[PDB]
């Protein structure tokens, strides 16, 4: 299956990229701030957009004694955030296949026109 | 039913299937009957031996100790040389240590290409 | 039974069917019950190795060529499909099925400071 | 306790009877369906032969033997005493043989002077014995046939061996 | 705690920074006040050894050894000159083999001590332990067993006829 | 890891699918509980590896001792096939029994749960060999098989032990353990997956039958196991086909790799190497 | 304290039904409450084809 | 009395003795003892106030 | 030193005055005295070796087995002194003469210090012990046993010999502190390989080697306990001992000659242990445990890696230690059955269970579980050898494999399971059983606690 | 203190499963001596199989009904 | 349940009344089995194993071929489970 694209590749990604001049700049957001993120330490795994959820998750998880009490508004913020990051890398792969997929219809279309 | 045992070195068959269980003439009965008879003249004896008050001690029985003469001090003294023996014996004895010999040599001499020739050495392996 | 005369160099002594000490009868007794085997019955060749708490050589309801057909031939099975298994991952796939399995893409991320403060 | 004896047919072919039985249990589980198809059995095992002559019957036991032994399933229940067991010999650890406890010394052997008393009374009874069944022994065999022990005549009848084994769940 | 203040203490890296931050629930953690109070009774009773032990203070005081010159020097047949020279060169061996010890030591208290970052100071502690250890492997490697200051010198030596035959070409 | 800890959970739980023995099945069960976090450290998530242990401990104590209290309850029988049906004759150990298959089960807001979903749906959502997912599904089925196995020998049946009734539940010592495990084995689930800092960091998307297949799975193992435990019951003698003497006999594994190797190897020893 | 029967099997005390209804019960109650306060079998919803305009395409 | 005097023995003689010990091998010597150093959020430390909380640019919720 | 060695020839007139029925206490009393004073040596030194006279001196590498040596006298007059008892007290006060006359040559050929005086008393040793084996061994082979202790340690020995006195010819002095600084390096050729062999040989026959051991086995069926309890704990480790003397000469040629005998080594361990896995009797069972443990000595003297000579000296000690208590312990089987072959033993636990104890605390340490000093000992050499070569993991692990096996074995075949019913002879272990093991196997236990006092010189 | 053995009397086969079974082998005409011993003890008495996922559902009678409180104090709440 | 000889004979008749073969009112402790009663061994297996199974004790075989008289079976599992009663 040509159309399909592999899993392992990033992507024509970066070409599409260039080719949607809307996307650029990917200007991710970035309020995690790198210096900051050591002094609560997180995990390596634990990088992410969504890491400042995360902060006052565990900000709010320290800050009550209730322990099982209270907190899921937090849980909520990070999972909400979590999710549509999800979505977005999920909305990559559809990118890359419908992109790949119409380089293999123009590129056909184009042997046609030169027959 | 259709599919049959097949007996092996490690499956002995079960003594219901042996055919000789059934065929069976009287000579072979007095075989059967042998066999009880000098097992009984032996348990008749262990136990005449096994119960008056007066043995005290251990009794070996006699087979044991042929057999555990016949473990070892029995083996030179037989032994014989032949050639399949003599072949087995140098197959089992030099040849596997031969292997050794090459497996690590080999191995030597690849560690020994790589840290002159190459440079592949270890780092940290300070300890020794 | 001797062996018989032969270059390993035991002789006069009786050879035995192998039998695993299981295979006498338990229900018997025995003057020498772990051992099961009364008094100055001459013992077999190779007794440790059938001593019990060694091999068994039990007869099984199952025959043995049929055992080890069957075992070996399950691992082989088991380890074929596995490694086929491993050609085509989830998410990714044949690409047939993967015209289905296809998705996310999604694990790109982290702050390109991550890219080197891992490093 | 009945040793010996070279076999013979009849015997032979109820084992197998109260084997497969058995085993038709072990399949069947529940006491109905166990019930329903060992009464077929026994009807089975009147149904075909119940009388014939020898050399057609020893053919149908070897029949026999394969079709149970292909239907002889792979584990059968058996009662923790038997030789399967799920305790064959847990309290081999404890049956202690009466001659140890000989043994004490005296700081001890104080403490339970009845059972000593009583102890002594047999170990006494069977040194005064012994002789006797030297005799017997010596008397009712012939050269030594199959058969194991002999009967009482007057006192005693080899009895050492059995009277005094150390029950069978001695803690 | 001396030991703890000399020479770990200036590459030790404390700092340490409680938080403490109060909400609607009451804090469990005002147990450990009860379990002080059973570190309080230790405390005491060390003071009850401790003024004792102050009363008398009979005490020790470190050794140190001069300076020889070295077997390179002395020459091929004196003995004592290789004795001298040995027993310093043994001497320093033990003493460097006793700095990868604390630099190792070091390296442990830096690992453990990031909750879960490290890749970083513990970065640099792995520099220097890189030096270190370089060229401790390379004072000291494949010497054997019967290590002596005479092969050391065998091993230098090679290592300059690496130099030489390297600024040839 | 994830390669071998599967086929370790399928392997043992087809033989987990029919014994006879009240402790061998349980055996089996956790080896092949075992198989599973193997590639739940395989599948590269450490932390829910480790939460999935602490959950099972309570589970698995919880089986063998009510299957301690069966054994000793009746002189000692493990085996199954003359195990009696006694639903009523020990009811708190009914209770126990039955909150400890449901845990070890995965029900969906009991203790066993908060592992076993976790980390069966992280394997589905997580890139990685899927044969072996497979063999992670089959492996969770069985679960459910065995488990309602013991169920319905020990306690369904009209009961078949051998007749006398020494059996006694009571001895109350007895009865606070099973009480603190069952506690446990009910709220653990809940505190702890609350309590522990949230290094698993959740995927919670695409798509709706991914969460729905770990319980979907269980119920066709229930519906299959019991349908067919009922057929069962209907008279008509058969004769094993030789998929059931293969998983009864253990895979054959230990028939044929301790009468076989050990038999070279002891021969050798003597037939060369000592002679 | 129990008698060995021959069918009966004398099943002593109350309180020991009680314990294991205690808890059977105790179960329900649990899977239930937690069912309602949250239905964590489900939380956000998800899917695929979205639209070309978000992606790219042109012609 | 007797859960008394066990209790005694058992818990109370053990965690003196230990922390004695403690006091030993901890105040003695460097790297005895390494903790993780706790995490510093945005909200000020207690070592010396300061620290602060970055951006919010987050909206919505739920 | 001379203080410690004086008062051990003392005993002997001491013995020969001794009142006839109270000589064992002299003996025993006064050996433990010594021992004591033996163990002040230990102190050593972190940087150079010890000295004493000209003609003495301790390195670290000999105390902790000079400590051992001195220790082991009461021990084997405690086993000896209830196996005799019949014999006229002549000749029991001749008797123990052997015994301490032997650990006096121990303790002069441990602390050498010429290699020509190490060596004479090092063949020096082989009188006592024969005299040992032959008069006071039981059943005949013992005669035979004889001859294969003998001559496989002098066809050893002597090429060693006239080795030794072509060396002090072609340098200066034999002396062994000079030679460890005036040592220069031999190599190649062929008369140089000569000297290789010739300078091993007889080490590698002492400590047996898997294709030479055969004589090993048949003295320990033969000899009388006190024969065994040296002949297995101390004279093995003594020839390695030797061994890593003198590779203070040597190299670079080791590194060419090593090979063979790593062979014979790595491959004889495992075939060893493997006969080691089917004896038909328990005496021999443990002869061949020994040798198999040896073989790991053997190959860590040869790969020369400090690391390799740390678990030398430690498996040297632990195995010396526990091999002796594993013979005494099968002695005490042997004198209540008369049995010897392990068969008959069977349900000796549930008729006594202390002795059950000790044979689960000895194997449990034979087959070498943490923190042993045999398996930390065992753990080092199996680092170096791991290093000197990647693949040798592969063997070492199959060791430790069947030295879990067999070890198990004895015990469980020699114990748990059915007592048999006619064996009315067993009679309830005296005190001095019981005091015997306990004192091998609880030094054993507190030494694990001060490694760093019994790893030797390359500490 | 010996129990008394109940009866030989008492047990009826008449009620049994089993006696679905003797009718079965009445059809064959086959003699099934031992059912009313085995069906005795067993199936005849106490001898009422529970329902299995009647059986799952041992505790839910009552704690529906104390969910339907906690759900009431969940309105109470409010 | 440490057992007695009582016990035993009467939970063997109570087995031996309910099989149907024998008439209850003609079954005795001493009453024989074949010579008296026409049950034949094929039955007599039956007997026997479904008595065993009563008590979960195991009948070897050699020792099954006796049996008999009921007399002789209580006396043999007097003789197992050494009742002294
Ligand atoms: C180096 C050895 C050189 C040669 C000596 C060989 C020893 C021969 C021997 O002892 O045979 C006795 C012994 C004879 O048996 P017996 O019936 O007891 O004879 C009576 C005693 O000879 C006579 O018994 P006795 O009790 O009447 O003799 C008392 C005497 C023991 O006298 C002896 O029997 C031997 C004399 C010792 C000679 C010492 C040689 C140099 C040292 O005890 C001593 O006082 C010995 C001298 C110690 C004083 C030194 C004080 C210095 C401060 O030999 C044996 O039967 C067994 C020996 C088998 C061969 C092994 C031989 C060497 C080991
Ligand atoms: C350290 C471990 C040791 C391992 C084993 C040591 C050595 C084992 C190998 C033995 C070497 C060969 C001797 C074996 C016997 C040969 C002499 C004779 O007895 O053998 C004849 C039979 O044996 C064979 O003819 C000899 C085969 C020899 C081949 C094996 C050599 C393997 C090489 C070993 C390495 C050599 C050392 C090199 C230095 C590394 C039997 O004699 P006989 O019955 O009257 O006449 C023959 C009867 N026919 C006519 C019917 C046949
Ligand atoms: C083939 C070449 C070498 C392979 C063997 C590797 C090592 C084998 C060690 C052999 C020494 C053991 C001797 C003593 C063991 C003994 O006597 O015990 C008998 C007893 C038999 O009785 P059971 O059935 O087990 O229990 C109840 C029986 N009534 O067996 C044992 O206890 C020993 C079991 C050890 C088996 C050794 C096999 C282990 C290696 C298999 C793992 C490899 C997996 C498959 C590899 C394929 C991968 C593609
Ligand atoms: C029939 C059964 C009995 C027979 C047994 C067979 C034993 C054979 C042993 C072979 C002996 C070889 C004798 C030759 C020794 C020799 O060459 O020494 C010379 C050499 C140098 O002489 P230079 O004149 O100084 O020359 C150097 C400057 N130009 O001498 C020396 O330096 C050292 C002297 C020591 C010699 C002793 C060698 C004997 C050692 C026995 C080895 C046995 C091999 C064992 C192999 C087992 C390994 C798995
Ligand atoms: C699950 C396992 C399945 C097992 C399947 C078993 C099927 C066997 C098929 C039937 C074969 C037979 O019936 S073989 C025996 C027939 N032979 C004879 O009858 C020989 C004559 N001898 C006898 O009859 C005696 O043994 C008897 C039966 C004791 C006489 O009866 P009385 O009660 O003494």
């Not at chain 2, 040849?95 to 270890?122: N, S």
């Not at chain 6, 058969?238 to 028939?255: A, C, D, E, V, W």
């Not at chain 9, 390096?185 to 040989?201: G, H, Y």
Request: charged content about 20%; aromatic content about 12%.
């Amino acid at each position: 299956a040509h159309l399909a694209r592999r899993y392992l590749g990033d992507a024509r990604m970066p070409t599409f990229p260039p080719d949607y001049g809307f996307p650029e700049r990917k200007e991710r957001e970035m309020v995690a701030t790198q210096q900051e993120m050591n002094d609560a330490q997180l995990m390596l795994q634990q990088r992410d957009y969504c890491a400042h959820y995360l902060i006052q998750l565990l900000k709010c998880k320290r800050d009550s004694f209730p322990n099982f009490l209270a907190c899921k508004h937090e849980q909520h913020d990070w999972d909400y955030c979590e999710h549509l990051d999800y979505v977005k890398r999920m909305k990559e792969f559809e990118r890359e296949r419908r992109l790949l997929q119409r380089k293999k219809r123009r590129e056909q279309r184009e042997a046609e026109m030169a027959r | 039913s259709f599919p049959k045992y097949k007996p092996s070195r490690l499956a002995t068959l079960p003594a219901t299937l042996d055919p000789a269980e059934y065929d069976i003439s009287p000579e072979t009965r007095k075989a059967q009957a042998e066999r009880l008879a000098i097992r009984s003249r032996l348990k008749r004896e262990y136990l005449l031996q096994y119960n008056d008050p007066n043995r005290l001690g251990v009794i070996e029985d006699p087979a044991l100790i042929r057999w555990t003469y016949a473990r070892s001090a029995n083996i030179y003294p037989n032994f014989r040389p032949t050639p399949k023996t003599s072949l087995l014996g140098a197959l089992f004895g030099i040849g596997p240590l031969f292997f050794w010999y090459y497996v690590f040599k080999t191995d030597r001499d690849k560690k020994e290409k790589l840290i002159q020739e190459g440079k592949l050495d270890q780092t940290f392996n300070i300890s020794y | 039974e001797p062996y018989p005369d032969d270059g390993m160099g035991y002789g006069d002594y009786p050879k035995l069917p192998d039998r695993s000490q299981q295979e006498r009868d338990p229900w018997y007794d025995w003057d020498h019950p772990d051992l099961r085997l009364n008094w100055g019955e001459p013992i077999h060749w190779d007794l440790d190795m059938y001593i019990r708490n060694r091999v068994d050589t039990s007869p099984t309801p199952v025959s043995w060529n049929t055992m080890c057909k069957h075992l070996f031939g399950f691992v082989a099975f088991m380890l074929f499909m596995f490694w086929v298994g491993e050609i085509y991952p989830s998410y990714q796939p044949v690409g047939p099925k993967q015209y289905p399995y296809n998705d996310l893409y999604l694990e790109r991320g982290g702050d390109p400071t991550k890219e080197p403060e891992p490093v | 306790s009945a040793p010996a004896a070279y076999l013979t047919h009849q015997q032979k072919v109820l084992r197998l009877y109260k084997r497969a039985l058995r085993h038709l249990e072990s399949w069947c589980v529940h006491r109905d369906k166990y019930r329903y198809f060992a009464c077929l059995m026994r009807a089975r095992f009147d149904e075909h032969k119940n009388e014939k002559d020898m050399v057609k019957a020893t053919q149908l036991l070897r029949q026999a033997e394969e079709e149970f032994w292909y239907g002889q399933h792979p584990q059968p229940y058996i009662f923790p005493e038997s030789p399967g067991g799920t305790s064959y010999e847990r309290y081999e650890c404890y049956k202690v043989p009466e001659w140890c406890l000989d043994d004490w010394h005296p700081s001890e052997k104080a403490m339970y002077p009845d059972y000593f008393a009583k102890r002594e009374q047999w170990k006494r009874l069977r040194r005064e014995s012994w002789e006797r069944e030297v005799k017997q022994l010596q008397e009712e065999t012939p050269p030594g046939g199959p058969r194991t022990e002999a009967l009482p005549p007057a006192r005693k009848e080899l009895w050492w061996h059995i009277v005094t084994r150390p029950r069978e769940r001695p803690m | 705690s001396w030991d703890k203040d000399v020479y770990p203490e200036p590459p030790r890296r404390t700092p340490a920074p409680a938080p403490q931050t109060s909400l609607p629930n009451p804090v469990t953690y005002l147990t450990k006040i009860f379990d002080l109070l059973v570190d309080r009774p230790v405390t005491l009773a060390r003071e009850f050894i401790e003024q004792q032990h102050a009363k008398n203070r009979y005490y020790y005081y470190h050794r140190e050894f001069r300076r020889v010159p070295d077997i390179t020097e002395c020459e091929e047949k004196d003995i004592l000159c290789m004795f001298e020279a040995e027993m310093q060169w043994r001497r320093d061996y033990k003493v460097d083999q006793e700095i990868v010890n604390i630099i190792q030591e070091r390296l442990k208290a830096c690992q453990q001590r990031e909750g879960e970052s490290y890749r970083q100071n513990c970065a640099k502690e792995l520099e220097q332990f890189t030096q270190v250890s370089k060229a401790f492997q390379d004072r000291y490697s494949d010497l054997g067993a019967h290590y002596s200051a005479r092969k050391c010198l065998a091993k230098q030596k090679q290592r300059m006829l690496a130099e030489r035959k390297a600024a040839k070409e | 890891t994830l390669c071998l800890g599967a086929i370790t959970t399928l392997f043992t739980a087809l033989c987990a699918i029919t014994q006879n023995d009240i402790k061998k099945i349980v055996a089996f069960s956790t080896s092949s509980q075992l198989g599973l976090m193997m590639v739940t450290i395989g599948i590269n998530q450490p932390h829910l590896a480790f939460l999935h242990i602490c959950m099972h401990a309570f589970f698995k104590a919880m089986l063998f001792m009510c299957s301690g209290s069966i054994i000793h309850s009746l002189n000692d029988e493990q085996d199954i096939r003359k195990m009696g049906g006694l639903y009523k004759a020990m009811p708190f150990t009914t209770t126990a029994l039955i909150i400890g298959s449901l845990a070890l089960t995965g029900m969906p807001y009991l203790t066993g749960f908060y592992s076993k979903d976790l980390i069966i749906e992280a394997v589905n959502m997580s890139y990685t060999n899927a044969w072996a997912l497979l063999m992670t599904l089959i492996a969770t089925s069985l679960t459910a098989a065995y488990s309602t196995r013991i169920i319905f020998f020990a306690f369904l049946g009209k009961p078949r032990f051998p007749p006398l009734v020494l059996i006694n539940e009571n001895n109350p010592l007895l009865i606070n353990s099973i009480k603190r495990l069952l506690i446990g084995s009910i709220f653990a689930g809940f505190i702890i997956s609350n309590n522990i800092p949230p290094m698993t960091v959740p995927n919670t998307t695409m798509p709706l039958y991914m969460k729905m297949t770990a319980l979907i799975v269980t119920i066709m193992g229930f519906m299959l196991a019991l349908e067919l435990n009922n057929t069962t019951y209907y008279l008509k003698f058969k004769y094993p086909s030789q998929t059931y003497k293969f998983s009864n006999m253990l895979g054959y594994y230990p028939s044929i790799m301790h009468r076989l190797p050990t038999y070279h190897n002891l021969s050798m020893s003597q037939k060369s190497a000592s002679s | 304290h129990i008698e060995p029967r021959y069918r009966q099997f004398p099943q002593l005390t109350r309180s020991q039904l009680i314990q294991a209804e205690f808890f059977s019960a105790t179960m329900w109650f649990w899977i239930l409450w937690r069912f309602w306060h949250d239905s964590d079998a489900v939380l956000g919803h998800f899917p695929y084809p979205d639209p070309s305009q978000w992606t790219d395409e042109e012609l | 009395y007797r859960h008394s005097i066990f209790a005694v023995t058992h818990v109370l003689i053990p965690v003196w003795i230990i922390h004695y010990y403690l006091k030993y091998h901890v105040t003695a010597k460097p790297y005895t003892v390494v903790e993780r150093k706790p995490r510093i959020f945005p909200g000020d430390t207690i070592l010396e106030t300061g620290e602060v909380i970055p951006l919010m640019k987050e909206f919505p919720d739920q | 030193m001379l203080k410690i060695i004086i008062p051990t020839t003392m005993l002997l007139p001491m013995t020969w005055m001794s009142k006839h029925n109270m000589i064992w206490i002299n003996a025993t009393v006064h050996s433990l005295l010594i021992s004591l004073i033996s163990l002040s040596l230990l102190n050593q030194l972190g940087e150079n070796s010890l000295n004493f006279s000209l003609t003495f001196f301790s390195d670290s590498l000999s105390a902790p087995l000079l400590v051992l040596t001195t220790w082991l006298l009461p021990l084997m007059l405690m086993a000896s002194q209830s196996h005799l008892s019949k014999e006229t007290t002549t000749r029991k006060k001749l008797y123990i003469t052997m015994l301490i006359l032997l650990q006096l040559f121990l303790i002069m050929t441990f602390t050498a210090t010429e290699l020509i005086l190490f060596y004479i008393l090092f063949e020096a040793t082989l009188v006592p012990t024969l005299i040992i084996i032959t008069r006071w061994g039981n059943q005949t082979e013992r005669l035979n046993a004889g001859l294969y202790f003998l001559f496989y340690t002098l066809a050893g020995s002597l090429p060693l010999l006239v080795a030794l006195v072509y060396i002090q010819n072609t340098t200066g002095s034999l002396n062994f502190l000079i030679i460890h600084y005036w040592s220069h390096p031999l190599s190649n050729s062929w008369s140089n390989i000569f000297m290789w062999l010739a300078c091993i040989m007889a080490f590698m026959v002492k400590m047996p080697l898997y294709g030479l051991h055969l004589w090993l086995p048949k003295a320990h069926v033969e000899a009388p306990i006190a024969g065994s309890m040296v002949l297995a704990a101390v004279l093995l480790k003594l020839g390695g001992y030797g061994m890593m003397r003198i590779t203070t000469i040597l190299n670079p040629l080791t590194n060419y000659m090593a090979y063979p005998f790593l062979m014979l080594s790595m491959w004889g361990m495992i075939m060893t242990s493997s006969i080691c896995l089917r004896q038909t009797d328990l005496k021999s069972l443990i002869a061949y445990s020994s040798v198999s443990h040896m073989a790991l000595v053997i190959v860590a003297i040869m790969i020369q890696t400090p690391w390799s000579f740390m678990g030398a000296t430690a498996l040297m000690i632990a195995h010396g230690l526990t091999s002796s208590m594993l013979f005494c312990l099968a002695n005490t089987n042997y004198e209540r059955v008369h049995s010897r072959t392990m068969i008959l033993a069977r349900g000796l636990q549930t008729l006594l269970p202390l002795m059950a104890t000790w044979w689960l605390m000895a194997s449990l340490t034979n087959l070498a579980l943490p923190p042993s000093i045999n398996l930390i000992g065992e753990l080092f050499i199996i680092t170096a050898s791991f290093s000197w070569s990647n693949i040798t993991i592969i063997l070492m692990g199959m060791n430790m494999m069947i030295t879990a096996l067999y070890s198990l074995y004895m015990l469980i075949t020699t114990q748990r399971g059915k007592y048999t019913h006619h064996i009315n002879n067993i009679k309830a272990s005296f005190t001095r059983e019981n005091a015997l093991m306990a004192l091998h196997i609880l030094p054993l236990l507190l030494l694990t606690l001060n490694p760093k006092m019994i790893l030797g010189p390359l500490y | 203190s010996k129990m008394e053995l109940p009866d030989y009397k008492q047990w009826k086969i008449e009620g049994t499963p089993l006696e679905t079974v003797q009718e079965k082998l009445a059809a064959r005409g086959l003699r099934d001596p031992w059912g009313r011993n085995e069906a005795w003890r067993y199936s005849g008495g106490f001898a009422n199989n529970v329902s299995f996922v009647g059986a799952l559902l041992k505790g839910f009678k009552w704690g529906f009904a104390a969910f339907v409180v906690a759900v009431g104090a969940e309105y109470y709440l409010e | 349940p440490p057992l007695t000889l009582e016990a035993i004979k009467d939970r063997v008749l109570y087995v031996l009344k309910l099989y149907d073969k024998i008439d209850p009112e003609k079954l005795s402790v001493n009453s024989h089995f074949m010579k008296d009663l026409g049950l034949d061994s094929l039955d007599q297996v039956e007997i026997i194993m479904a008595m065993e199974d009563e008590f979960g004790f195991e009948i070897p075989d050699i020792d099954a071929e006796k049996l008999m008289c009921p007399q002789e079976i209580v006396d043999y599992i007097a003789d197992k489970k050494d009742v002294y009663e």
